[PDB]
């Protein structure tokens, strides 16, 4: 009935970009949606407390970069922020 | 106006910048939200999604499965050391645990 | 350091020649450290005061020569670029003559040397008061290089004339270099 | 006309590498399709000469030959410096017999060039060579020694002008790069411009200096049939034979251009490959023919047998004679295979543009080596089993 | 004559803003006096090459009325690379200055090998297996004859020369690598050097045992090569023609996605907007359009129906009267569209309609042109199936006895068209397997007829495009309107406009209207995707 | 056919493998029953050290030694040999380079800048952070080359299938129109030979056909293809010469600068921008008409 | 400065275990304790470095350490 926000088509086109011949079942796709929502909530909370620490009312890409360096350990964060870097390099 | 073009295509991204911006604004995380923050968040989420789905496909390739099932996602999450460290307090439904046997148990 | 935008463009073009176009500068370089250090020796004495910074500029040039002699194989000289450093010793090991890079290397290597000095001064206990005039002298070098961009640094190509201080690298030197 | 074949007994007794695409099996079994049919009535067989160190060295450097004449797989560790700078690393595997195979191939090439130079034989065909992807000091495109350029400088003693036609194998460039500033040598290649391992060149390469407008290059796309190959081969060859006053042809047959190969997809059958030499044999200019590659030895042996039958100005029958390698080919047992189902991508508007701008831009050690031992003992007459 | 209107004319011609900035940059680059005549003419030929009137208008002011990215020059310092045996004219014709590299054209991108699927992969694997085994056995027999040559010459007369027969390496031949190679092949990693050293320094003693360790190995290799060739030929009997197919193997997945209506409407709209532009203010768009279809013969209008009924009697999804009503309506379009009353089944008139009948007619001409292509090579195939037969040298181990297509699937003894139609009908009835049909079609032909690999699929779509042709209200209504207006004689610009305005105002604007112009002159049919001059 | 064990050569060797049974029985009687380079960022011939796990290439060494003869002692590192040679040595209990300054003759501007290069590892030129961030268009590559017009792991088309793609736009669906020819020429499914290949641009999305410009390959797997409608990297003139090697893109603190000059008779060696040394002024269309009027007035003297 | 993992004293580890109620201490306990202390310290120091580099600061305050401990769920009072 009412419209519901979901990450269906975006995760599916990412999957088709990285694996053109591999699908996903409903349960695993719900797991991936909840994973995306939980990582979104964690990064948003980390950026919110970072902005509240510095008396900053503005959350920019630097807050997201700091949150990804904080929560995600190892080199897995680094490539991620590198992706974010070229994202900014494609946006500007 | 002009031709409507999404911010994901301008930034070379598949995840929605506008939806992430909407959830950031309505999620009361901050009073003001920058323009590059949804782009950076969408890029990070897209990279994590692509890495996890690629690991799941690699774990399901030798299992003769062309579809991602929760067991494949659990295997991909717990097999990677950094994914295990990041998702340390994360429970995956219908995934079980890794099939590892200790050396003392084997005769 | 206040590197000029034209000089930054020259350095980025040098990187793109070394990496993408994959070419190697001439071993018998037309320009070297003599026509800049001797230019400083006979040039700054005609518009500035005779005492003061003349002797300090001369000892700065001597220190630059001594640094360039022992820094060529350490802080400079890309992976492709080091190949010409090898056989120069092989000629030197049979001709009974020591090799120096003072007379044989161009001003682009001086640019490289004055661009890698900020990332090594912080390693040791660098005295700021004794070196403030050294950053002043380097910024004098940048503004002087900003003055002279036409008769010293050429933008030509070796495809039609061999006077561009940069020649191409064949697959022989690619094979013996990028191994 | 008079034609001659050059063949050595131990010319297919090598091993290029285990599982590597290009093989030395192609040549020797091709000779098994020569005597078994009965083609030896016009075959002047000359054995390949075991060339020495400095005899062939007029093109490649001294250190290159000194490397390949003193390298074995047993002592590859102490020669690892020259293995990575001579392009004999992972691109070209190291096997025993490199120097001897290169020497006999160069001797056969020099013998064919000298026999063309005297004029005793009208056509000098030789499939023992065919290695031309290499350069002056490197070994690229799975080829170690350039076996055409020494033929060029051998016919340059008598013939002032030569015509080099390169049928597509692996986008050859050694003959083009060896003579670019000289108007005495004319080079051309019908090929595929793609992401190949040795692939260099461009359509805009027309020549510089005195060799300007004499180094043309005709690029094609991935997949061309026989009719379009004829339509692109006829006008440029007719124009260059009109405007050069030719004297010799050093055309090289394409081994990797047949239907079915490990790398490269080109749709030429026996008729399409045969028309390239038919058009240049209609002129009557004397010619020396260089062999080719071929990732499948059966198809390249079949087209080499068809080519050898065609140089006798006869049409060989559509059946293969029995031999010791009779079971190599397909179940059809026909010389003329069917073309593969490659989509015709070459639109003739681009071909017409290429014709148009091509018309626009075009308007020591007993040298001259013709000494080798006589053959005749390499009898390929077995019995049916 | 003036030049002030050329700039706004070019601005209207280019259209895009950023391309206009790029053209402005190029023209300024010319204006600042460094660009020669060749650069400006070769850039105008790409910027303004679509029109020649404005080009020649530009040429009256200024104009005429080396190497590519590779092959870069090397200096004259590394040429002194001392090559022994260089003649007087060797330096004249050979230059080391201009060299080319594959990495120069690749521009730091690596090298990618064009590999095929697993069929060609295993074909190349067994091909190199054949190469290695054949090279091994031929080197073995060459060493048999070589070692048998050098025993009778020293075994015949005396024995003092047997003990002292010191020889240079080469064994008295021009060969210099083969015998040590096969000693390394047939012996251990460390043994072969001292076996070949003994051989070299002391023959006529180790020669009989090195022949003994090479004769029975040769005969075992020959027997295993014979059985390997047997299983190899059994492999080629299936994989010889499968390796020659690269688009027919993917034609099963392709025909499921390029047979939809969206691809066809995009296809026709491509030439529709190709005809739409560059035809305003200087020309009148003709009512006749491109993408015409030619019908040379009329026997192809019936034989496909011999499959079609064979489909719907085989299909159990449809009900009882659905088959007969489908046959009735299809005979109706046979009767009125082609103006043919009745013919034996073989074993300017314009119409306005919509998308579903359009794509049905598109697959109709697709199957028609497939069969036209089939009958185009029918004469040459019926010529050289007769020359195609087993040879007299293949009766040793009963070759061509793998039961692939010998059950009557071959084209021998009958016409190729009738036999392939019977084979497709056997596919329809389920008596014949799909892969057996694929192997039979790739064996009986020269792999040129790749379109017929999914024929049952497309005729399924055909009956679907008939089953929905008389299902919904709108298409049935326009079909009844066309039948009521069909008198087999229609005059242009007399009563077609009334029918056009009657059928345009009934459907909505979402479904576009297309038209078919058919005339009896060589059965010419033209299809136009008309979108304008219909609502006015 | 499905059993390759007995059907192959199982008694002697294998399909291609060499079983031990040739070495076991050989009828012999003549024996009468008894790492990674951090300063290279590449892969190749590595050489390690006995004191540190780091490794360097054989070519990047400060003593040029040929690779066919390795140095003895497993090549103790530069750091260890120079800490046992000059750094940790006699006259302890003080900073080592303090006495360096008293050992210098006629040099005073380099107080401690000559002792560090004496006892540091070999290192190729790596770009400084401020220089590489000075030009945002200049970025590092896979192993660290220059990458501007070029172009995850962290430890195909043969028939008419791709030509239907890249014709309908993914965003709007409007047909991209070629420049030199006014027809996009998608072709027919009934006749595949009417289908024509079209290209796209990675910079301004300019459509281009394969027939208008000579192309045969796809430059999309390591190098971005540039359409022949932009400003070239370098020009070539023939009448010692000037090639106009662009001017590069400066972006830090908007250092490109934006001010209108008179824009005519200025001679700024190119370096223009369009709005409806290192000095760039804006260009509008009016100055374009002005300086073309000047150019065709001065070109035709008669 | 380059080798300072020996700065953690072995009787200091003994005192830390005595605060934890440990009666008997083996000789291999000290090295593992130094290793786990080193990895925990470098994790918290990396988090504090990221916290103080988001704020364009070159000195790490106590609030950065408190927030870094709160990020890992080990919040410490008093600062």
TrEMBL record, chain B:
Residues 1-78 form the Core Histone H2A/H2B/H3 domain. Its main location: nucleus. GO terms for molecular function: DNA binding; protein heterodimerization activity; structural constituent of chromatin. GO terms for biological process: heterochromatin formation. It is found in: Chromosome; Nucleus. GO terms for cellular component: nucleosome; nucleus. Residues 1-8 have a biased composition (Basic residues). Residues 81-107 form the Histone H2A C-terminal domain. Keywords: Acetylation, Chromosome, DNA-binding, Isopeptide bond, Nucleosome core, Nucleus, Phosphoprotein, Ubl conjugation. Core component of nucleosome. Nucleosomes wrap and compact DNA into chromatin, limiting DNA accessibility to the cellular machineries which require DNA as a template. Histones thereby play a central role in transcription regulation, DNA repair, DNA replication and chromosomal stability. DNA accessibility is regulated via a complex set of post-translational modifications of histones, also called histone code, and nucleosome remodeling. Belongs to the histone H2A family. The nucleosome is a histone octamer containing two molecules each of H2A, H2B, H3 and H4 assembled in one H3-H4 heterotetramer and two H2A-H2B heterodimers. The octamer wraps approximately 147 bp of DNA. This is Histone H2A. It comes from Xenopus laevis. The lineage of its organism: Eukaryota, Metazoa, Chordata, Craniata, Vertebrata. The chain holds residues 12 to 118 of 130 of the full protein.
């Amino acid at each position: 009935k009412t419209r519901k926000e979901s990450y269906a088509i975006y995760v599916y086109k990412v999957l088709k970009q990285v694996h053109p011949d591999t699908g996903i079942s409903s349960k695993a796709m719900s797991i991936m949606n909840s994973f995306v929502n939980d990582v979104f909530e964690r990064i948003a909370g980390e950026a919110s407390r970072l902005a509240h620490y510095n008396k900053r009312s503005t959350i920019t890409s630097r807050e997201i970069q700091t949150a990804v360096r904080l929560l995600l350990p190892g080199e897995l964060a680094k490539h991620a922020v590198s992706e974010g870097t070229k994202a900014v390099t494609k946006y500007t | 106006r002009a031709k409507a073009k999404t911010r994901s295509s301008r930034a070379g991204l598949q995840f929605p910048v506008g939806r992430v911006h909407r959830l950031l604004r309505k999620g009361n995380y901050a009073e003001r939200v920058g323009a590059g923050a949804p782009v950076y968040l969408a890029a990070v989420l897209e990279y994590l999604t692509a890495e996890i789905l690629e690991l799941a496909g690699n774990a399901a390739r030798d299992n003769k499965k062309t579809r991602i099932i929760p067991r494949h996602l659990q295997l991909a999450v717990r097999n990677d050391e950094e994914l295990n460290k990041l998702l340390g307090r994360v429970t995956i439904a219908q995934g079980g645990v890794l099939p590892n046997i200790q050396s003392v148990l084997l005769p | 350091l206040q590197i000029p935008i034209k000089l930054k463009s020259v350095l980025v073009d040098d990187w793109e020649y070394v990496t993408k176009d994959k070419k190697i500068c001439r071993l018998p370089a037309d320009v070297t450290v003599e026509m800049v250090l001797n230019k400083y020796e006979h040039e700054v004495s005609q518009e500035l005061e005779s005492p003061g910074s003349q002797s300090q500029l001369s000892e700065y040039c001597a220190g630059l020569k001594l640094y360039f002699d022992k820094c060529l194989g350490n802080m400079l000289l890309y992976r492709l670029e080091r190949l010409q450093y090898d056989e120069l010793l092989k000629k030197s090991s049979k001709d009974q003559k020591p090799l120096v890079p003072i007379r044989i290397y161009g001003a682009i290597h001086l640019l490289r040397l004055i661009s890698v000095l900020p990332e090594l001064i912080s390693s040791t206990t660098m005295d700021l008061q004794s070196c403030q005039l050294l950053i002043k002298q380097t910024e004098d070098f940048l503004v002087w290089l900003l003055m002279h961009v036409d008769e010293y640094f050429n933008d030509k190509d070796p495809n039609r004339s061999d006077d561009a201080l940069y020649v191409n690298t064949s697959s022989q030197y690619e094979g013996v270099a990028l191994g | 006309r008079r034609v001659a074949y050059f063949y050595d007994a131990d010319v297919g007794n090598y091993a290029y590498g285990a599982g590597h695409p290009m093989k030395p099996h192609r040549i020797r079994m091709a000779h098994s399709l020569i005597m078994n049919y009965g083609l030896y009535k016009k075959m002047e067989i000359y054995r390949a000469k075991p060339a020495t160190k400095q005899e062939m060295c007029q093109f490649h450097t001294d250190e290159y030959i000194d490397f390949l004449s003193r390298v074995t797989p047993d002592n590859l560790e102490m020669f690892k410096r020259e293995s990575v700078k001579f392009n004999v690393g992972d691109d070209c595997p190291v096997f025993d017999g490199l120097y001897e195979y290169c020497s006999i191939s160069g001797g056969g090439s020099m013998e064919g060039a000298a026999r063309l130079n005297r004029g005793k034989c009208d056509v000098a065909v030789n499939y023992a060579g065919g290695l031309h992807h290499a350069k002056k000091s490197e070994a690229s495109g799975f080829c170690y020694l350039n076996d055409i350029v020494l033929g060029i400088i051998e016919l340059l003693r008598y013939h002032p002008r030569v015509l080099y036609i390169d049928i597509d194998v692996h986008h050859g460039d050694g003959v083009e790069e060896a003579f670019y500033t000289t108007d005495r040598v004319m080079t051309c290649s019908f090929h595929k411009y793609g992401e190949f391992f040795p692939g260099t060149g461009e359509l805009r390469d027309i020549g510089v200096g005195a060799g300007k407008n004499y180094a043309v290059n005709v690029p094609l796309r991935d997949g061309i049939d026989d009719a379009t190959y004829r339509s692109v081969f006829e006008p440029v060859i007719k124009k260059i034979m009109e405007w050069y006053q030719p004297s010799a042809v050093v055309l090289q047959c394409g081994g990797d251009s047949l239907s079915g190969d490990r790398l490269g997809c080109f749709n030429l059958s026996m008729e399409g490959h045969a028309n390239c030499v038919n058009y240049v044999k209609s002129f009557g200019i004397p010619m020396m023919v260089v062999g080719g590659g071929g990732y499948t030895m059966r198809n390249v042996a079949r087209t080499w047998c068809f080519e050898t039958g065609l140089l006798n100005n006869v049409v060989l029958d559509k059946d293969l004679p029995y031999n010791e390698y009779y079971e190599y080919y397909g179940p059809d047992y026909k010389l003329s295979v069917r073309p593969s189902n490659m989509f015709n991508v070459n639109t003739p508007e681009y071909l017409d543009k290429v014709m148009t701008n091509i018309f626009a831009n075009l308007e020591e050690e007993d040298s001259a080596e013709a000494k080798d031992t006589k053959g005749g003992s390499q009898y390929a007459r077995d019995l049916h089993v | 004559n003036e030049e002030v209107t050329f700039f706004e004319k070019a601005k209207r011609y280019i259209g895009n803003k950023h391309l206009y900035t790029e053209f402005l940059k190029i023209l300024n680059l010319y204006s600042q006096d460094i660009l020669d005549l060749d650069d400006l003419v070769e850039k105008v030929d790409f910027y303004l090459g679509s029109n020649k009137e404005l080009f020649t208008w530009f040429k009256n002011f200024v104009g005429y009325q080396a190497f590519g990215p590779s092959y870069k020059r090397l200096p004259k310092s590394d040429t002194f690379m001392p090559c022994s045996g260089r003649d007087d004219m060797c330096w004249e014709v050979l230059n080391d200055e201009w060299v080319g590299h594959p990495v120069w054209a690749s521009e730091d991108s690596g090298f990618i090998a064009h590999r095929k699927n697993q069929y060609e992969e295993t074909l190349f694997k067994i091909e190199e297996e054949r190469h290695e085994y054949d090279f091994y056995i031929e080197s073995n027999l060459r060493t048999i004859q070589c070692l048998e040559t050098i025993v009778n010459k020293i075994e015949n007369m005396t024995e003092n020369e047997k003990a002292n027969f010191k020889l240079p390496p080469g064994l008295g031949h021009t060969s210099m690598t083969i015998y040590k190679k096969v000693i390394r092949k047939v012996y251990d990693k460390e043994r072969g050097f001292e076996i070949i050293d003994a051989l070299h320094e002391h023959p006529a003693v180790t020669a009989p045992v090195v022949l003994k360790r090479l004769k029975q190995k040769d005969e075992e290799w020959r027997r295993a090569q014979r059985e390997w060739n047997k299983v190899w030929r059994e492999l080629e009997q299936k994989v010889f023609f499968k390796s020659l197919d690269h688009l027919g193997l993917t034609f099963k997945q392709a025909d499921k996605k390029l047979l939809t209506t969206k691809q066809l409407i995009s296809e026709i709209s491509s030439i529709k907007v190709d005809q739409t532009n560059k035809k305003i203010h200087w020309l009148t768009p003709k009512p006749k359009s491109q993408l015409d279809f030619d019908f040379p013969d009329k026997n192809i209008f019936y034989d496909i129906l011999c499959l079609a009924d064979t489909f719907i009697t085989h299909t159990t999804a449809y009900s009882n009267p659905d088959k007969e009503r489908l046959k009735d309506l299809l005979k109706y379009f046979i009767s009125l569209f082609f103006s043919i009353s009745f013919e034996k089944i073989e074993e300017i008139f314009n119409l306005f309609a919509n998308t579903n009948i359009y794509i049905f007619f598109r697959h109709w001409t697709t199957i028609y042109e497939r069969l036209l292509e089939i009958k185009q090579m029918n004469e040459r195939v019926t010529k050289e199936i007769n020359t195609r037969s087993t040879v007299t040298f293949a009766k040793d181990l009963d070759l061509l006895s793998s039961q692939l297509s010998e059950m009557g699937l071959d084209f021998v003894g009958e016409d190729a068209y009738k036999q392939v139609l019977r084979l497709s009908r056997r596919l329809i009835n389920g008596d014949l397997e799909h892969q057996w049909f694929e192997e039979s079609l790739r064996q009986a032909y020269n792999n040129k007829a790749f379109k017929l690999y999914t024929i049952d699929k497309v005729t399924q779509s055909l009956v679907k495009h008939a089953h929905t042709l008389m299902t919904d209200a709108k298409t049935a209504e326009i079909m009844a309107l066309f039948v009521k207006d069909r008198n087999a004689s229609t005059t242009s610009a007399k009563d077609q406009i009334i029918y056009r305005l009657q059928v345009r105002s009934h459907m909505s604007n979402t479904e576009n209207m297309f038209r078919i112009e058919f005339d009896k002159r060589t059965l010419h049919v033209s299809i136009q995707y008309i979108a304008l001059d219909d609502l006015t | 056919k499905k059993r390759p064990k007995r059907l192959s050569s199982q008694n002697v060797n294998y399909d291609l493998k060499r079983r031990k049974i040739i070495t076991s029985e050989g009828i012999e009687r003549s024996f009468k029953n008894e790492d990674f380079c951090s300063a290279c960022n590449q892969s190749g011939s590595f050489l390690c050290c006995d004191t540190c796990p780091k490794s360097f290439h054989f070519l990047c060494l400060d003593p040029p030694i040929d690779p066919n003869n390795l140095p003895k002692g497993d090549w103790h590192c530069n750091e260890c040999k120079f800490k046992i040679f000059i750094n940790n040595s006699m006259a302890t209990l003080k900073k080592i380079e303090s006495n360096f300054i008293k050992q210098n003759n006629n040099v005073k501007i380099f107080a401690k800048l000559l002792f560090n290069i004496d006892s540091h590892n070999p290192k190729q030129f790596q770009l400084p952070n401020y220089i590489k961030e000075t030009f945002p268009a200049v970025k590092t590559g896979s192993r660290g080359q220059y990458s501007d017009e070029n172009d995850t792991d962290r430890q195909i088309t043969k028939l008419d299938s791709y030509n239907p793609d890249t014709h309908i736009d993914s965003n709007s669906g409007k047909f991209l129109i070629c420049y030199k020819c006014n027809q996009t020429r998608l072709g027919s499914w009934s006749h595949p030979e009417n289908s024509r290949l079209i290209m796209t641009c990675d910079y301004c999305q300019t459509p281009w056909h394969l027939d208008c410009v000579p192309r045969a390959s796809f430059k999309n797997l390591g190098s971005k293809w540039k359409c022949p409608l932009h400003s070239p990297t370098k020009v070539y003139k023939k009448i010692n010469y000037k090639v106009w090697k662009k001017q590069r893109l400066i972006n830090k603190k908007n250092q490109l600068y934006y001010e209108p000059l008179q824009k005519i008779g200025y001679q700024n060696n190119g370096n223009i921008q369009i709005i409806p040394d290192f000095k760039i002024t804006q260009i509008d269309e009016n100055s374009i008409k002005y300086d073309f009027f000047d150019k065709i007035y001065k070109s035709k003297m008669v | 400065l380059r080798d300072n993992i020996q700065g953690i004293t072995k009787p200091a580890i003994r005192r830390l275990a005595r605060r934890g109620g440990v009666k008997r201490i083996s000789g291999l306990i000290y090295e593992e304790t130094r290793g786990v202390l080193k990895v925990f310290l470098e994790n918290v120091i990396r988090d504090a470095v990221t916290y103080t580099e988001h704020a364009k600061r070159k000195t790490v305050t106590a609030m950065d350490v408190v927030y870094a401990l709160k990020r890992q769920g080990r919040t410490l009072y008093g600062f």
